[PDB]
Design a protein that fits this description.
heteropentamer, A mainly alpha (54), B alpha/beta (217), C mainly beta (232), D mainly beta (336), E mainly alpha (285), A: 54 residues, mainly alpha, B: 217 residues, alpha/beta, six-stranded mixed β-sheet, 17% strand, elongated, binds ligand 1KD, binds cholesterol, G-protein beta-subunit binding (chain A), acetylation (chain A)
Chain lengths: 54, 217, 232, 336, 285
Amino acid sequence: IAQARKLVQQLKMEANIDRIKVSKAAADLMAYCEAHAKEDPLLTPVPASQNPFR
Amino acid sequence: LSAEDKAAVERSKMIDRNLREDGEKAAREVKLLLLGAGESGKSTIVKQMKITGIVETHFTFKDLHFKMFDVGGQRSERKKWIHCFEGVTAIIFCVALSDYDLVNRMHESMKLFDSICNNKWFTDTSIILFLNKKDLFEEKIKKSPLTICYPEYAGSNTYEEAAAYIQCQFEDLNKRKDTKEIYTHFTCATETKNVQFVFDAVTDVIIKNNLKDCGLF
Amino acid sequence: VQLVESGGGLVQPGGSRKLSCSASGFAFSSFGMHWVRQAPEKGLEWVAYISSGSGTIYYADTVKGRFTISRDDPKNTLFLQMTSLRSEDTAMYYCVRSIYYYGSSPFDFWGQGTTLTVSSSDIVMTQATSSVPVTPGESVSISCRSSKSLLHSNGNTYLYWFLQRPGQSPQLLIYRMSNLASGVPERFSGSGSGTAFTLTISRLEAEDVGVYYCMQHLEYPLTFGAGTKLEL
Amino acid sequence: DELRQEAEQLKNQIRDARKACADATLSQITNNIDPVGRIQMRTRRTLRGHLAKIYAMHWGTDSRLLVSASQDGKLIIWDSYTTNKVHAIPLRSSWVMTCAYAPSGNYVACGGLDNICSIYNLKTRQGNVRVSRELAGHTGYLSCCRFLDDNQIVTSSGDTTCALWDIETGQQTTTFTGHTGDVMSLSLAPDTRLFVSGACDASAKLWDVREGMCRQTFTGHESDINAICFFPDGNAFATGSDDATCRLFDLRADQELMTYSHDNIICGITSVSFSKSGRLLLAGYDDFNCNVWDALKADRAGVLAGHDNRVSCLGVTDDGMAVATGSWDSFLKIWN
Amino acid sequence: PAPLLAGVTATCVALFVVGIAGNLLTMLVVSRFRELRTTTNLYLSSMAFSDLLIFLCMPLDLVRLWQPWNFGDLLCKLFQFVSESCTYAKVLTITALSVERYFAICFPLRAKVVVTKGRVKLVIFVIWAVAFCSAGPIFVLVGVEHEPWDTNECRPTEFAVRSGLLTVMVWVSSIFFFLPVFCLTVLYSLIGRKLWRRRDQNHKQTVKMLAVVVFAFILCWLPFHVGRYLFSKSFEPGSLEIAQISQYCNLVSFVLFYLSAAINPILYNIMSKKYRVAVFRLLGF
Ligand SMILES: CC(C)(N)C(=O)N[C@H](COCc1ccccc1)C(=O)N1CCC2(CC1)CN(S(C)(=O)=O)c1ccccc12
Ligand SMILES: CC(C)CCC[C@@H](C)[C@H]1CC[C@H]2[C@@H]3CC=C4C[C@@H](O)CC[C@]4(C)[C@H]3CC[C@]12C
């Protein structure tokens, strides 16, 4: 009963937050992935000249 | 192609030498996972052996180094850390014979024994089963019938029969009788007999593991 | 950390001596150890090296055959047995600890040195200057020049800068040409490329005066520069 | 039972408020983008020093050194470019199931069934690694730890709580108590003002280390969450669970974006990590191999299948050059 | 010297394929899997190497069966050196495996304390050194000697026949039969005596396995050692009719010598389930 009034307050604090649309957060994630696409050695396989693991 | 990388490689090789020596030293230890459904029984056997999380008891019997890990202080999910003990030499399971009238408690001991014996991590790890408080179950059955725990048990309530019934009720819990053995000892008053039984059970487990290592079994 | 050297003294030319180095306050077993001499009014000269675990031993070509370096770890002692001593082995011998792993700082601690007085393809590191006058507050640059290029294929350049203050053992300032040793104030900065190297003191103090030595650790024998001294 | 039902009446409105923001799925958005190629990483290095199962590893911020903990009682620090063992720390307790490497590189951390977070100093005036500190507040097994700086560390434990310590005094300056199950994984935000913790109550929680409170709870999974990791942006994270499914949660959208699962995979995930760009999601499975997922399209991009036992730990370098997988077969493999 | 060789040659090359597949597999299985370095398959890896070279030396042996060979010079020394040295290394490895089994079974705790896998590597080196030094004088006793050049043989040169070199090396080689049989028999009888006194149906299986190992050793090796004694007797005394038994015993002894190397990998790892799991793991199945 004492911790249930804590769960109620926690849910009240997690309920009254502002949320952006998923079409907006997904667009930002996609834009971040596209911006830093080049500086990703695992995505774009870097040539062996500057690959420290050979 | 190396300037002072040679000295780093030499240091790495010395570290490898030390790691191999430590591994060889640790491979000579006998690790025993001590389990049970209450410290009332487990606490009396650590006193038998030579002298906050996991509690490791290191002792030596007949020039053999045993490390026995008591993990009853982990009030967490057992399934999340039990696989850490996959390569343990044996499991020492302690149940009290006098909790056949308490609370239901013997049934929880069976629940834990069945859950441990039939894990996917302990398919080959044999179990040493200690039936503690032999002297309390001795005079409880005179004034407390065993059927309070075993309604289907039809027999005299003499110690020699009622104790064997519990022993079979525990040894009938493993669903894999062709990969592991249950060594059962009725924990006695004598100081050296329990550790002698553990020594004998570990000698068999070592012999049967060697037979598997040599490809003969 | 402490290295105490003993055994030096007056010797006859042809005799023999045994220098010992008692270590204290560090894991002597994990550190490779060097003997480095310094002749009277001359610069540092590397004598011998024994690795951790005694698995690798190197000597200077001027002492190979005569000197033998040994190590007894359980009592934390380093030995240099010097036979057939000749009149140009008279020097002060320093016991130097040196640990080698990735990012380590070798040659970081030097012993206080013991004086021996014997009675009556190498990389040439060049310090063109020999002495420059300085005033506290101003900056100064000490230039070193190597015959071979100290830059290695693994990327790091093996140049070490040491400072020997008047009446004291040498102190490591910079290791591998750009890294400040622990406890060294940030006034010192090491730069350079391949064969030409510079040490810069941003602002002189009364405790930067002394002789500055550059050493190559690219390959054995380890060679030092002639040493150039800052002076007020 | 008024205040015992106002709780799920708030839960209903949380769900209804985060369903009004679900207008288009991440699949619908990233549909037109080109799929990644075939991600075929060859193993470049094999580290062969541990004698028991490896439970955790962590890269250094210099992308060269890495620490790994094994239940042989060892904490080995490797130079991954040369496979050289820089250090080998013997632990007071062999039952280690986590390790962290400080961003400065001066310290390492370890912990496990001993309920202790041991902080080891790597750079001492002597030549050995010394036990700098022992943090002894948790009452359940310590499953993860992450350095904020040289003085602060956040640990997750099996007592269903997380903790923020200060190493100098050895006391925990903050305790994070929201979970109802064992907290199994922990990930620090890139700015280290927030961190996510995934627990056995099938939920992840977003905590802030300053005010020490839970801000959001994410409850998409069906089983225990074993791994967690922020997107490199810091505005999203990915969880891996025992239900053979990884999935992506967004902090700002306060819900789930994508589910990474396959019919052929029925095994739990032990470790999760992101590529440097965040386009690839690296998930270590306990079917002995790791999967590389297209994080934006949920497509399975590749497989890393060089281990003979469970892949227990996974980590991508800070420059994104390589990915290290440590497995229960006592081997660490660098892939590139 | 009949045309029958056209069938046993096919059996010999099938034995080659089976033994190579069983021996190369063992080494790359032991190397890959950490738990398969259990100081029993280390000896098995060494014996797999020995059987591998034996089979590599085999093709030079096959051609001689047919009937005057100019096949080489110093081919007889490095042929009959690596081959016989390997017969010695594999029989000494079998002896070592017997002692390791005896130590690990009859003295399990003392073996747990004593055998540290550091001394085992040293035992392997000692075994190889003894095999090489015992197969040393093969450099001398056998060369080539025609009685034109078209009638030469890969034979022990008549220097050994006139002297006491060939008939003493027969004894030296028969040591490598008598010592191992007299060690496997006694140690595997002691192991069986312990197990029956310790007494399960599983122990019956172990007794059967060790009896099969002893029987296979006696079957593969005594016919060889006897035929080796059977020739090197026709030379100096000049046997008249014994030469009829001499050649046939050595064709039979020849196919059992290679059958030994073929079945060695599948005689010590057939019932090791941990080995089977890794075998299936490493290949597709
Ligand atoms: C390496 C190996 C396995 N090849 C080998 O043992 N070589 C021995 C040489 O060892 C040296 C040695 C000899 C004697 C005692 C001690 C050591 C050899 O020189 N031998 C084998 C017998 C054979 C050919 C001649 C076989 N046969 S036959 C029917 O062709 O198969 C056949 C018939 C008649 C006469 C002779 C022979
Ligand atoms: C050409 C031939 C005749 C040369 C002789 C090669 C022999 C001496 C060598 C080649 C490969 C070697 C083996 C390779 C690896 C191992 C594993 C380790 O536990 C050491 C022993 C052991 C088992 C070696 C024993 C000796 C060995 C068999």
